[PDB]
Amino acid sequence: ASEKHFKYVILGGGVAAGYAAREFAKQGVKPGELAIISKEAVAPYERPALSKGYLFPQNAARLPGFHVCVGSGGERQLPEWYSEKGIELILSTEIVKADLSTKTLTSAAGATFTYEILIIATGSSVIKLTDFGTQGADSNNILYLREIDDADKLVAAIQAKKGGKAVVVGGGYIGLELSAALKINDFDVTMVFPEPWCMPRLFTADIAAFYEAYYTNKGVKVLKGTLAVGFDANANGDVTAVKLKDGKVLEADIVVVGVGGRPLTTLFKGQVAEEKGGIKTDAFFETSVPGVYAIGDVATFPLKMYNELRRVEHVDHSRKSAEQAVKAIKGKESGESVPEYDYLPYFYSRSFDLGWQFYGDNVGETILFGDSDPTSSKPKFGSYWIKDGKVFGAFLEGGSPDENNAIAKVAKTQPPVASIEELKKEGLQFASK
Template sequence: MAEKSFKYIILGGGVSAGYAAREFEKQGVKPGELAIISKEAVWFSRLSTLVLCISHITLNYISRWLLMNAPRSAKGAARLPGFHVCVGSGGEPQPPEWYTEKGITLILSTEIVKADLVSKTLTSAAGDTFIYEVLIIATGSTVLRLEDFGIEGANLKNIFYLREIEDADKLVQAIGNKKDGKALVVGGGYIGLELSSALIVNNFQVSMVYPEPWCMPRLFTADMAAFYEGYYTKKGVNIIKGTVAAGFVSNDNGEVKEVKLKDGRVEEADMVVVGVGAKPLINLFKGQVEEEKGGIKFYGDNAGDSVVFGDHDPASEKPKFGTYWLKDGKVVGAFLEGGTPEENTAISNVAKVQPSASSLESLASEGLEFASKI
């Protein structure tokens, strides 16, 4: 089994890894010092087109992908659209060739099954060992599955989730196999809205069920949601609010045929698509890191004591506030929200230089003035 060593390893092949790699390159990382390890065979700039571009708050990316994806059994054409991530704040696209040019090692199709933070080693499913000096955990999240809630029949055939490209491949194939069928979408968030529209375009009878009083309640007001719900209803989507899927009934082939709702109703379905959220993917680090709210706790005790400065009153018209992290007499981290370009540069310099500071109290008192002196 092979053993490889790197000064820096980023574990995870998502957008965070891309932005981190870009920053490493800006800071002059040397060829061969940095590696990115991902279990995916496809580099994130394409994978993220499918599952991460929804953060741009545009309700058509995923459905567009499905409609453009081969095979032609589902309406569409191209395999993946030409969409670049890690360019939201400026900068050049980062296809795989970019990493090669910068001397950054991409290690794809490699699932890490063991992480030892004490010995600073990662072990792959193939038995290869990766040794690092600094590890950046960018493993992201995985879908919440209905099995996690103990729902009866949640493992039946033709119940789909959408997180990775292979999930989309299976879904596209099912759309072709179940032409003019009935589909039930569980969840009223991004995935639910996107997939409902894609299924309608592919001539399915679509029902969408979610427990909230309106779709996307974390982002939409009631009025905003009413506009989308009205539009979807006009297109033929049957929206069912205030209840959840409580169980699934199969046919003789083990395929889902009915969905039992908690309010007692039963909906026919040839396929079900589930989008009920995600959870942090931290199994590799259980017992080795401090956890908080289901994820890895960061900053705070991990990076030193912190102090907030500035105007962080949400009622302020233009709030400007920031944080310093102090450890062993040095400012090891800094953050600023609402600053000018000059102030942002000053804060960035603090994080890079890691200057000495006498106390949290002095940092709170000086605020941005401390950064301007560096």
């Protein structure tokens, strides 16, 4: 009798959930039809803000300001946006069991929820140094950043330790955005990572060299090809230092770690087909279980333009896959045709006064173009990835919305390159024309 049933259940209260709810309201959802179950205590928000505006030392972004869908220029969805529509937000509720055969979800406290259609939007986990048993990685003030709860703990630690020393472990987008956030919050910052350069799975050595030099000039000590092998801590269990493989010690009042993550799909293992580490879906985000969909970070879906199954961690995909799934679900109900998902990979990052965008596929060979001098007033440079005589990928730092739209069009249309050398001479003009 305490069990709750909903025609549609979104599991997770993140970017994809929030955008899926907007498409349900667009599609004409009736009160009582939809529930969003989330372990977070707040309504869906624009997660990229957590490593950006949330950490500003002045005029920081705070909720309710960055709830979905403001991040894409849409309208804000306060908790009241859901309740007025009879869309039930079930917050601070962690689902610990999902039985797809009985369409039942069970919470940690044993509350049960059944559905007709399930949308899996559980996002990604955070890989922790304690997962590998790294010596003293359990020390207090060794922090990770995924959710607003993490962001609040980081904000509190920054206030407690400001004027102090911070070490950032990891050289990916988290490493880069957090090193900058700590520096702008008046910390002595050291960035350490074992790979030969930052954003190792996306940046080329030449792109990374710009960021390493720019960070160095901001006063960030960048230690590439360096491995953190332990941590020192005091009688309170608070971190005091980061030990390096060579034997060096970095003093630290705070340590922030960003070493990637994995699709949070533990609830569904063995119940749905998996591919390339994610839950496999078709062009409509439907899994191997009929009526079960998977969106955002967890989906391994058909990337139409590359004729392959892919998995991404992009806020743009999170928003668009959410809209696709809802359109597909409502399409099956009415028997109306829905086009296959046609996504152009798009990733971006911002730190200090920098901002870059990437579109397409980072395959083939690379060429660098523009002004890549880190001391430039307004640096503006890019890179193209060329394979089989055509541009597959495009990167641009410091572009205007027009220049970013131009490099997106290059990645979308994959124009031929008769002369790669000649493309390097054309640079940013190649995209704009």
